[PDB]
Amino acid sequence: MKLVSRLTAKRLQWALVYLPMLVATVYFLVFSADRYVSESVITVRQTSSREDTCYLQTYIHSMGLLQKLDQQLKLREHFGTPLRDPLFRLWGGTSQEWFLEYYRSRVEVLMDDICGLLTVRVQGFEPEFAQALNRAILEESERFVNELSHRMAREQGQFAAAVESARIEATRKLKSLVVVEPPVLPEIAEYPRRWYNLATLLVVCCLIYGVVSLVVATIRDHQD
Amino acid sequence: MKLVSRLTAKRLQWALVYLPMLVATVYFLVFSADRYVSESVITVRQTSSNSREDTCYLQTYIHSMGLLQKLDQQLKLREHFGTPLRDPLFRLWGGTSQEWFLEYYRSRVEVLMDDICGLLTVRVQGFEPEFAQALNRAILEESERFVNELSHRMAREQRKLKSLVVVEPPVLPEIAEYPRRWYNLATLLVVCCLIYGVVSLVVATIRDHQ
Amino acid sequence: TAKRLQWALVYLPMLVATVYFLVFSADRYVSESVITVRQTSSREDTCYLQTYIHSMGLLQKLDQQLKLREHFGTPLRDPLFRLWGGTSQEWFLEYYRSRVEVLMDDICGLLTVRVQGFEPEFAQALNRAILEESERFVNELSHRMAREKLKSLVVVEPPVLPEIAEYPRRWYNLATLLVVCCLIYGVVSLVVATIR
Amino acid sequence: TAKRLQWALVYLPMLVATVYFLVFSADRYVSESVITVRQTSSREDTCYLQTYIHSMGLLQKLDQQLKLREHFGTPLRDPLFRLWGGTSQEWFLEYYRSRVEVLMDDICGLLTVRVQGFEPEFAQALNRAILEESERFVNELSHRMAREQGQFAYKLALAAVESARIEATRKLKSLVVVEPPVLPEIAEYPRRWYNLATLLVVCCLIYGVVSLVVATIRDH
Amino acid sequence: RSPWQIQQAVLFALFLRELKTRLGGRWLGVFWVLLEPVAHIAVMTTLFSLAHRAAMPSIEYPVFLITGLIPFFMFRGLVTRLMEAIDSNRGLFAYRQVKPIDTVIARAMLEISLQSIVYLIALGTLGWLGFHFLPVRALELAGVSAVLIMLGASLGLFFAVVTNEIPQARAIVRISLLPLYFVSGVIFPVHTIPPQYLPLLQLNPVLHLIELSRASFFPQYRVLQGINLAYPAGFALLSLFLALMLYRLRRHQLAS
């Protein structure tokens, strides 16, 4: 009622247009941090079949792989280095579930159904770190598939002439991973697109400002 | 346009309302001829492996011409189908062409295919029940002979290879299925009425318009 | 006026068709045959037969064998359906394709061939020659393939001697022409009255 | 301005179209062939052929053999239906692709080729040339396919090498021809009347839209 | 007073009137425009959920349905509501500051504002349910949405001008708005239809616009051949040109 009339067009414009611009401009151009990416494409194949691709896709975003990677390369201390950016940074002392969600948000895995290839894009604050993380993910991936095959063959051997065949099956890497494109080394950051984000923000705030101005004008007219 | 006013209600009635049942009653009751029907059900199997397509082969072969020539030489269909002089509509006139004879034979012998799982049903019409049964049996035996010769030829060019399964043998009818006299009279009444109502409406509006 | 479209639109085609079909038309007998190619030990061979029946080389071999160019020029009374003397080879091909109709029934793979001619024995001979040459081509294809009786033709219904002229249907053609001419009259009269 | 637009918009393009089509045009005889490749001992091979007809290396071989360059420039009467002297290679390739039509019947699985030429014998000779070049193309493709394993490679291994060396000379794939090239005598092209009717439709559409534009801008 | 200022005044007043009459006396229309996508989603998931899961195993069905449905709802509303604007204010054309194009623009802006509110609410509840609700490339989404809006408004104005007379034809276009739903990729992904039916479906510009909006929405979404933006852009431009021409020519006979 009275609070509805307690504003003006300039006040609404300052509330919904220029203030988000100010915070976004002082974030993206000043307070933001770069995020290099490293891209690879992989696909497993029987030696001498999209199922093992599903196993891989679930295993990349798994939790045990995260524990192995944290033990190996210490991802927790690396992702907290960019204080400049308090958001996309990993705050220290956080819970394990938030760490897992952060890791899942960083590395992204995509599938294409027509070809069956698995593409992995890893985000890091350093290019060499991103390449090393991608390579570690790939080698742990190959080790996981080979260990699954060896575990099945070792169970078959543990059941038990055929002992030599079981030992051969345990030693033989039946499933192998072939890398179509090795993990690349980025040169510049590409994901924190500042200007494009500012532009889509401009479209969004223009739209919501227009809609809210129309509805507040009609409720002002109806309340009289 | 002057003849439009001539068509009164009593006139158009005698025209297409009553007349048609007059001619239908004096035909279907005292002029028509009974037609006994014999029905058989068959299917050809895959015994020549050491199969709907062979059934459609048989469907095309039954309504063919060479089979009709064989049956006319065997059982003399042409003289038999001219027996009822009472009904000319259901009779084969003497001296007609060969093509008209073929169309008459195709009209008399009806072949249908159960398509969900392929059963060939054959219904044969004849003015005597024993003749209908005999024609059905002759059709079946020539059917088996052709489907055997169908393979015998390529075997000779390169034993009973194929076989005919007789699910329902040619039965001997007791009473005549066709023509359905009272049924046709009822449908005729329905149609003659409908067209009389429609034409009465159209003649009423064309009388009002002019 | 309206009498010009009353008379000159519908009547004159009817007199033309009457003086053509009743007296100037020539009777055309037709023979029929129903076949299927099957290996003696198969739709591809059926399609091969379909494109080979209406081909050029087969027309040349048939013209050598039976001389259809002389046979299709006999009726002088019919100016439309006769084969004019000294015409082009392509028009001869279209005439042959019109005079030999082939239909495909793909639910079971059946070829049916209807051959028209002005003599019944000639029509049967043309049908038999077509069947024989098509069979010869069917095995000759495999012979040329394997050179550097492989197949056979199954005859469901052999060629049949016709007794009466199935073609043309004079009364049927006159009736459907009459119907269309009246329809055309109705639509042109309605638009020419509603434009006023 | 209500009659002058009709004069040049349609009347004159129609008139120039008829005088060009009835006088300035030249005959174009078409040779037709129907083929399908078959394995001696399948859609992919005829697909390779269908791509290969409209290729460029085949066009270069045909230009070297039958000398297509000078023939397509002989009909001096047509300025637009002839190959201009000293044109581009890309325009020559587009001209060859436009003058040779290839259709596929997938249900029947047959490839039909219609080749145009300004002489009755040239169309047949060119069609036979494409036939021979396609046969030798699939033959050489199979030979190159077998050549790597032939050149890659105790007594049984040498016996296998001897038994496999004949793969580079055996004629594994053969071109089966259903309808050979023909010798026409009446030109199929150009179809003057259908193009004329298309000009009627297009000219009427442009006249209507420009009349609407002019009538709208008139009261402004 | 400039013409622009009186144009804002008349558009504001006409928007107020048309928003009052579009919803009910006690705002019953807002419930219907909130419930119609809900009912459409309910029927479509309960009829084709497993089939769409089998179609592609990368995009959830409700988000696909929303992204293909809300733009189509806006387009259908713009087409079908813009053309009744002439007959709703026949008696209003007597105050010399009111023109038919003002009613057209007022109806269009309302249709746009209402459907934008519905789109924002739907994206909010889609994100609230744990689905995917952030467009990866929002600027291209805005561009394609603007093209679709301009095409719909142009077609609505064209049908309003042409069918000022013969109101039966008005009804007809609503019937033809029903098969347009079932062809333009709204329900099922277009990758599953047999390919020889493809180009006959590719003259529909709404199919191209829906496909490009979905492609700019989802990450790694595959488009077919000939789904260019140039064809809908040209269709919209030509339709707007013809509509404005016909409104200019047939302007004076839209009187009381």
Ligand SMILES: CCCCCCCCCCCC(=O)O[C@@H](COC(=O)CCCCCCCCCC)COP(=O)(O)OC[C@H](O)CO[C@@]1(C(=O)O)C[C@H](O)[C@@H](O)[C@H]([C@@H](O)CO)O1
């Ligand atoms: C077959 C296609 C799909 C199946 C639809 C089956 C139709 C449903 C059954 C009828 C449902 C129904 O209610 O009828 C509808 C008929 O369906 C349509 O619209 C056809 C839509 C065409 C556009 C499709 C584009 C696709 C988009 C792709 C991009 C309205 O027609 P109607 O017969 O009812 O109108 C009679 C009125 O009483 C009076 O109108 C007149 C008249 O007589 O004065 C005037 C005028 O001429 C015209 O309106 C009218 C007539 O002539 C013009 O077709 O007659």
